[PDB]
Amino acid sequence: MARPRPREYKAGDLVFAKMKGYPHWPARIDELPEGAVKPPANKYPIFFFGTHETAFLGPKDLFPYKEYKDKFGKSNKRKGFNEGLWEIENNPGVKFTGY
């Protein structure tokens, strides 16, 4: 038996986000304000800590932060990464408009 990862997320949720070419990255599910252009189905607006970049990703590339912390939460020399580790713990609301 193996627990599935979430297939839905809510704004404010803290995760690790994975994109091609980069390590699993400390990140947050931002909100999608209504009265805006709809996103592609099942994609969430992502905020990366450290770099403060954004993207849209589905659940396959998302790993809930607390659950995957010590598989993905090791230091890494990529620019922003270690700052991101710091932010997901001490300031995970930074620029968060959700609430």
Binding site: M19, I46, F48, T51, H52, T54, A55
Partner: peptide, 5 residues
Amino acid sequence: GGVKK
């Protein structure tokens, strides 16, 4: 920051 594409 910008869009991580």
